[PDB]
C-alpha cells in the first residue's frame, strides 16, 4: 500500500479574522422549528 | 448516548470496581463532579461517553480493557478526553542542562547517519563491524564454493 | 548520476582514469615524454537507438544477417565468446547437415515413403514452420539459432517451386549493442565475419547449381532428391573449412598499428618501410575506436605478438580485416565529430571562468509511445508466438506520457543542478577538496535495465575501480563491459572537442613494451589550475580525459538523441516472435488509497484494469518496458533527492542569517515546482481516472455508512491535494517509471517542506 | 500512538509477566532505557510501538503471538524491531553452520557488504576502525609534511 503519511502532517497558513466570533459553532445541529397550528 | 458494544463491557467493569472498594466511589464523584451515590455515577456513565472515560481513568486496574474498547468505537471523544485528563509530568532539575551536553554528540551521529543512509542502516552497519571476524571468513568461503 | 573530484582522480574516478586503463596504478603519468602528434578523424560506433524488426520468413539465407545473430548472441549471453559458438556450430553441422541419414528423414516426413512423386503436380508445398518442427525432433541442439540457420537452408536448396510455400515467416528484434567496441568485441567481429564466409558458401551458386539441374526436369525420386541434396550440403561444407584466427588476426593487426602510433619505434619496425601497401593502414591509422581497443589489448595480454608474415601476408589480412569491421559488425565507420554530438556540458561558474562544479549530460528527448502487446499460441510449448497489438491502451498510455515528456526533459534537470551548485557553494573553489565534476548517462543506465541489472553496481565499481568476482561469469561481462562503455564514451567525447592530441609510451621497471596513452593539448584562459596540471604558459597538457573536459567552454548538445519505438503493429500481427518474454513486463497494479473524514477512516483499493477504463480484468496483456523512460525518471529522482540533502546540509553549516533565507527559499521554491509537476500529472487522463474513481468509491462507501457530508469535505484545501498527488504517484508506479519505495520517500519531502499547506489552490486540466 | 487494537494485546501480556516475576525489570532498563519503576515502563509501551516491540520480544513465555500481532497492526515497526533486536550466534565447530541459525547473520553481512563495496573492502573498512587511534594521527602528520 502507498504511504500518504508524511504528506498528512501539515499546518495551514494562519490568519486572524477582523471581527472575532462564531467560533464554537463549528459543529452543532439545531433540530427543526415547528409551524403553527392551523384552523 | 454511549454505544452498547462499549457499554456492555463498560458498566459491569465500573460496577465491579465500586463493589471492590468504596474509596473510589468518592473519588470519581469528585472528579466527574457527580452525586456521591454509586447509582448516580452509573446513571451518568450511560449518558455521556466523555464522562465514561474519566471514570475509567480513575480506575485503571480492572478498567483499562473497556477504556480502550471505548476509545475504538469513539474516535470523537479521543481528542476531548485526552485534554480533560492530564497531569504535568514532574521534571527533574538536572534534566534540561544535562541534555545540553549531548548537543556536541548527537550532531556527530547525524553526520554519520546522512553518509550511510537512514538511521536503521547505521545501526546495522555498526553491528557488521562489531561482528566477529570469522563470519567474514565464512561468507568468503561460501563464495569460494560458488554460493552468492 | 556519477560524482567525482577532478583534483584527485586516483581516489574517486580511478576506473575512469587513463592510468587505470593502461594499467599503471601507482602514479600519474608525466606529460613529459616522447610525443608523436596525430589526427583522429574516424571511429567505430554501434548506432544509438537502433531498434528494428527483421523478418526471417522464406527468402534466401541472406549471408550477412545470420552472422549478426551469432554476434548479437555471444555478446548478449557471455558464453566465453564466439569460438565455442562456431566450432559447436560445425559439430551440429557435422552432426546433422553433414549426415545424410537426417536428410532422408525429412523427405520421408514431407511426401511419403519409397515412391515416385512428380514436382508441383503430385507434390504439395509445405510451410517452413513445419520442417522446423521436424528439426526440433531430428536435431537435439541447444540454441534455436542453429535451427533457423538450417531451416532457411533447407528452404532454399529444395525449392524449384518445390516443397515450400511462400506464405510462412518469422521475425526478430534488433536490440541495442555495446556502442564502442571492446577488444573481444573485435575478436568476434572477425569470427562473425568468418561465419558469413561459411553461409555465403551454403547460399553459393555451387549449392545453387544443384537446383539448376532440377529446375525444369521435375523431382521424381525421394532419395535421388535427398541424396543428391545431402552431398551438396557436405561439398559446400568441405570448401568452407578453415579460417583465420581472430585471436591472432586482431592481436597482430593492432600491434602493427601499435608500432605505427608509438613514438618509439626503432627504425626498422615501422609499417611504411616494411609494408608493401600503405593504403590499408592509412585508413586505420587515424581510427580512434581502435586505439582504446589497443589499450585494452596490451593491458590484458601483457604482451604483443605477430605470427603473421611481415608484408605479403599482412597486406592480405588487413584489406580483409577492413571488410569485417566495415559491414558485418553493427559497428559502422563515422566521422568523429558526429558520433558524440548529443553529449552536452554545463559549468557551475564563479568569477574568472573557473568552475565550481561542471556537469556533463546526455541530451534526450523523452520517448513516449507504449505498445501493450499480448501472447497468442497456435502451437504448444513454442517460444514463437503471434503477439496482438491493442490500440487505445497505447492511446491511454500515450495520452498520459504526452504531458510527462514535457516536464521531465533532460535539458531541464541540468539547469536545475547548476542553480543548486551556485546557491550552495558560497566560497572559494580551491578549498573543499578542489573542483568537482558530476555526470550522468541515461543511455548507460538504460543498458542495465534491459538486462534488469541494478545500475548502482557499476557506479560503485568506478570509485573503487575493481570488480567483485563473486558473481557469475555472465554478470562480470555485463559489469565490465559497462564499466568500459563509460570509459569509451568519455574519450570519444574529449577527443571530439580537443582535436589536438599526442601519443606517448609509458615507463615501468621490468620487461614491458609498454602502452600508449594520449595527452591532450588544451588552451583556455584560467589563471588557476583545476585537477592538477601546470596551466602554465597559457596552455595545459593532461593525460586524463576528464581534466581535459573541464577546461572546455560550455557546450550545447548538438542533436537530441531520440528513441524510435520498436514498431510491432507493422510486422508483429501476422508473424511469430523472438524472446519477447523478458523484454516486457506483466501488467498488474495493485494499490489502495486512504483518507480520514469526520474522524472516520475510509479506504478505496484500486486495480490496474479499472484505471484504464477496461471492464474486463485481463492479465494476458503485458507492457513493453520503456527503459529509456525509466532511465530518465530514475535519474531525475536521484538528482532531486541529492539536492535537498545538500541544501539542508549547506544550511546548517552557514551559521549566518542572510544566507539561511536564501536556502530556505530554495527548498520551498523546489517543493512547489515539484508539487505542481505531480499534480499536473494527475490531470492526465490516467491521472483523472484515478481521481474520479478514488472519490467515487469513497462517496458510495460512505452513503451506506449513512452520512453524505463528503461532497463538501473531499473538495477542500488539503484533501483535494492529497488525493491529487496520490493519483500522480500512482500513474508513475502503475507504469514502470518508478519504484513504490522511491515514491514513498518522495512524499516525505513534501511533508517537511510544508509546500502543501502553503498553496491551497488547484488547477484542473479537464 | 499505540494502536488500541494491539494495546489490549500487549498490556496484559507485559503486566502479567511483570507481576509473574520482578526479574523482568532487567530487560526493560537495559535496552529501552525506561525508568526504574514498573509504572513508567508501562507508559513507554503505550507511547511508542518500537518501545513496545522490544518489551514483547524480551518477555517470551506468553509474548510471541502478541508480538506478531503488533507487527501486522503497525507494519512500520517491522524493519525497526527485527533489526534493533539481534543476537550473535557465536560459532559452530562443525563445517555446516548453515542458515539454520546463522541465516539472519549472513544476510546482515551482505547488506553491509553491498553498501561499502566488494566483500574485501568491508573487511578492510572493518580494520581501519579497529586500528589504534594513533595511526590516524600518523597518516595526518605524514600528510602535513607534504607526503601523500
Curated annotation (Swiss-Prot), chain A:
Packaging motor with helicase and translocase activities. Part of the packaging complex that packages the viral RNA segments, replicate them into a double-stranded form and transcribe them. is one of the structural proteins of the polyhedral procapsid, which is responsible for genomic replication and transcription. Displays single-stranded RNA-stimulated NTPase activity. Residues 21-30 have a biased composition (Basic and acidic residues). This is Packaging enzyme P4. Homohexamer. Part of the packaging complex composed of RDRP, P4 and P7. Residues 18-39 are annotated as: Disordered. It is found in: Virion.
Swiss-Prot record, chains B, D:
It is found in: Virion. This is Major outer capsid protein. The lineage of its organism: Viruses, Riboviria, Orthornavirae, Duplornaviricota, Vidaverviricetes. Assembles to form an icosahedral capsid with a T=13 symmetry. Drives the penetration of the inner capsid (core) into the cytoplasm. The keyword Ligase does not apply. GO terms for cellular component: T=13 icosahedral viral capsid; viral outer capsid. Homotrimer. Coiled coil: none annotated. Its main location: virion. It comes from Pseudomonas phage phi6 (Bacteriophage phi-6).
Swiss-Prot record, chain C:
Transmembrane segments: none annotated. Its main location: virion. It comes from Pseudomonas phage phi6 (Bacteriophage phi-6). Keywords: Capsid protein, Inner capsid protein, RNA-binding, T=2 icosahedral capsid protein, Transcription, Viral nucleoprotein, Virion. Homodimer. Associates with the polymerase complex. P1 is the major inner capsid (core) protein of the polyhedral procapsid, which is responsible for genomic replication and transcription. Forms a dodecahedral shell from 60 asymmetric dimers. Binds to RNA and may be involved in genomic packaging. GO terms for cellular component: T=2 icosahedral viral capsid; viral inner capsid; viral nucleocapsid. It is found in: Virion. This is Major inner protein P1. GO terms for molecular function: identical protein binding; RNA binding.
Amino acid at each position: 500500500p502507498t504511504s500518504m503519511k508524511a504528506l498528512d502532517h501539515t499546518s495551514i497558513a494562519s490568519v486572524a479574522p477582523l471581527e472575532r466570533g462564531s467560533v464554537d459553532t463549528d459543529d452543532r445541529n439545531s433540530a427543526p422549528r415547528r409551524g403553527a397550528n392551523f384552523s | 448516548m454511549l454505544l452498547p458494544v462499549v457499554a456492555r463491557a463498560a458498566v459491569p467493569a465500573i460496577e465491579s470496581a465500586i463493589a471492590a472498594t468504596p474509596g473510589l466511589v468518592s473519588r470519581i464523584a469528585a472528579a466527574i463532579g457527580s452525586k456521591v451515590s454509586p447509582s448516580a455515577i452509573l446513571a451518568a456513565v450511560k449518558s455521556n461517553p466523555v464522562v465514561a472515560g474519566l471514570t475509567l481513568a480513575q480506575i485503571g486496574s480492572t478498567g483499562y480493557d473497556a477504556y480502550q474498547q471505548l476509545l475504538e468505537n469513539h474516535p470523537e471523544v479521543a481528542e476531548m478526553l485526552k485534554d480533560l485528563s492530564f497531569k504535568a509530568d514532574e521534571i527533574q532539575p538536572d534534566f534540561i542542562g544535562n541534555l545540553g551536553q549531548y548537543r556536541e554528540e548527537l550532531e556527530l551521529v547525524e553526520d554519520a547517519a546522512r553518509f550511510v543512509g537512514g538511521m536503521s542502516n547505521l545501526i546495522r552497519l555498526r553491528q557488521a563491524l562489531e561482528l566477529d571476524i570469522k563470519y567474514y571468513g565464512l561468507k568468503m568461503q561460501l563464495n569460494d564454493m560458488g554460493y552468492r | 548520476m556519477f560524482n567525482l573530484k577532478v583534483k584527485d582522480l586516483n581516489g574517486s574516478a580511478r576506473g575512469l582514469t587513463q592510468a587505470f586503463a593502461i594499467g599503471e596504478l601507482k602514479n600519474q603519468l608525466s606529460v613529459g615524454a616522447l610525443q608523436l602528434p596525430l589526427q583522429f578523424t574516424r571511429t567505430f560506433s554501434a548506432s544509438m537507438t537502433s531498434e528494428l524488426l527483421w523478418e526471417v520468413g522464406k527468402g534466401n539465407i541472406d549471408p550477412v544477417m545470420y552472422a549478426r545473430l551469432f554476434f548479437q548472441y555471444a555478446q548478449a549471453g557471455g558464453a566465453l565468446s564466439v569460438d565455442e559458438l562456431v566450432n559447436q556450430f560445425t559439430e551440429y553441422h557435422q552432426s546433422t547437415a553433414c549426415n545424410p541419414e537426417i536428410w532422408r528423414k525429412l523427405t520421408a516426413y514431407i511426401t511419403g515413403s519409397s515412391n515416385r512423386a512428380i514436382k508441383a503436380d503430385a507434390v504439395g508445398k509445405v510451410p517452413p514452420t513445419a520442417i522446423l518442427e521436424q528439426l526440433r525432433t531430428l536435431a537435439p541442439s541447444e540454441h534455436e539459432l542453429f535451427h533457423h540457420i538450417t531451416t532457411d537452408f533447407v528452404c532454399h536448396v529444395l525449392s524449384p517451386l518445390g516443397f515450400i510455400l511462400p506464405d510462412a515467416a518469422y521475425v526478430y528484434r534488433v536490440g541495442r549493442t555495446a556502442t564502442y567496441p571492446n577488444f573481444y568485441a573485435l575478436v568476434d567481429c572477425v569470427r562473425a565475419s568468418d561465419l558469413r564466409r561459411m553461409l555465403t558458401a551454403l547460399s553459393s551458386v555451387d549449392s545453387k547449381m544443384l537446383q539448376a539441374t532440377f529446375k525444369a526436369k521435375g523431382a521424381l525420386a525421394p532419395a535421388l532428391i535427398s541424396q543428391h541434396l545431402a552431398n551438396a550440403a557436405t561439398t559446400a561444407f568441405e570448401r568452407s573449412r578453415g579460417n583465420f584466427d581472430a585471436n591472432a588476426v586482431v592481436s597482430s593487426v593492432l600491434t602493427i598499428l601499435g608500432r605505427l602510433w608509438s613514438p618509439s619505434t626503432p627504425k626498422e619496425l615501422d609499417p611504411s618501410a616494411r609494408l608493401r601497401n600503405t593504403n590499408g593502414i592509412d585508413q586505420l591509422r587515424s581510427n580512434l575506436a581502435l586505439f582504446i581497443a589497443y589499450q585494452d589489448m596490451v593491458k590484458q595480454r601483457g604482451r604483443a605478438e605477430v605470427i603473421f608474415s611481415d608484408e605479403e601476408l599482412s597486406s592480405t589480412i588487413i584489406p580483409w580485416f577492413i571488410e569485417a569491421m566495415s559491414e558485418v559488425s553493427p559497428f559502422k565507420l563515422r566521422p568523429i565529430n558526429e558520433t558524440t554530438s548529443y553529449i552536452g556540458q554545463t559549468s557551475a561558474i564563479d568569477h574568472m571562468g573557473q568552475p565550481s562544479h561542471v556537469v556533463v549530460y546526455e541530451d534526450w528527448q523523452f520517448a513516449k509511445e507504449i505498445t501493450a502487446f499480448t501472447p497468442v499460441k497456435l502451437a504448444n510449448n513454442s517460444n514463437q508466438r503471434f503477439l496482438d497489438v491493442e490500440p487505445g491502451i497505447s492511446d491511454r498510455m500515450s495520452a498520459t506520457l504526452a504531458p510527462i515528456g514535457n516536464t521531465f526533459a533532460v535539458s531541464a534537470f541540468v539547469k536545475n543542478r547548476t542553480a543548486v551548485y551556485e546557491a550552495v557553494s558560497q566560497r572559494g573553489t580551491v578549498n573543499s577538496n578542489g573542483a568537482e565534476m558530476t555526470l550522468g548517462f541515461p543511455s548507460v543506465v538504460e543498458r542495465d535495465y534491459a538486462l534488469d541489472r541494478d545500475p548502482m553496481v557499476a557506479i560503485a565499481a568506478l570509485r573503487t575501480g575493481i570488480v567483485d568476482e563473486s558473481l557469475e561469469a555472465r554478470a562480470s561481462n555485463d559489469l565490465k563491459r559497462s564499466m568500459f562503455n563509460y570509459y569509451a564514451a568519455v574519450m570519444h567525447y574529449a577527443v571530439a572537442h580537443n582535436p589536438e592530441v599526442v601519443v606517448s609510451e609509458h615507463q615501468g621497471v621490468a620487461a614491458e613494451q609498454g602502452s600508449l596513452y594520449l595527452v591532450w593539448n588544451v588552451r583556455t584562459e584560467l589563471r588557476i589550475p583545476v585537477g592538477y596540471n601546470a596551466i602554465e604558459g597559457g596552455s595545459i597538457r593532461t593525460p586524463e580525459p576528464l581534466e581535459a573536459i573541464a577546461y572546455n567552454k560550455p557546450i550545447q548538445p548538438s542533436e537530441v538523441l531520440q528513441a524510435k519505438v520498436l514498431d510491432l503493429a507493422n510486422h508483429t500481427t501476422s508473424i511469430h516472435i523472438w524472446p519477447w518474454h523478458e523484454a516486457s513486463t506483466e501488467f498488474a497494479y495493485e494499490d489502495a488509497y486512504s483518507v480520514t473524514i469526520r474522524n472516520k477512516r475510509y479506504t478505496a483499493e484500486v486495480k490496474e484494469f479499472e484505471l484504464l477504463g477496461l471492464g474486463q480484468r485481463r492479465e494476458r496483456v503485458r507492457i513493453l518496458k520503456p527503459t529509456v523512460a525509466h532511465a530518465i525518471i530514475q535519474m531525475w529522482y536521484s538528482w532531486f533527492v541529492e539536492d535537498d540533502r545538500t541544501l539542508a546540509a549547506a544550511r546548517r553549516t552557514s551559521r549566518d542569517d542572510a544566507e539561511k533565507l536564501a536556502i530556505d527559499g530554495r527548498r520551498m521554491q523546489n517543493a512547489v515546482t515539484l508539487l505542481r509537476k505531480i499534480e499536473m500529472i494527475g490531470t492526465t487522463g490516467i491521472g483523472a481516472s484515478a481521481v474520479h474513481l478514488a472519490q467515487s468509491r469513497i462517496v458510495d462507501q460512505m452513503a451506506g455508512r449513512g452520512l453524505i457530508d463528503d461532497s463538501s469535505d473531499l473538495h477542500v484545501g488539503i484533501n483535494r491535494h492529497r488525493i491529487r498527488i496520490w493519483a500522480g504517484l500512482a500513474v508513475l508506479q502503475m507504469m514502470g517509471l518508478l519504484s513504490r519505495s522511491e515514491a514513498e520517500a518522495l512524499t516525505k519531502v513534501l511533508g517537511d517542506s510544508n509546500a502543501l499547506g502553503m498553496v491551497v489552490a488547484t488547477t484542473d486540466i479537464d
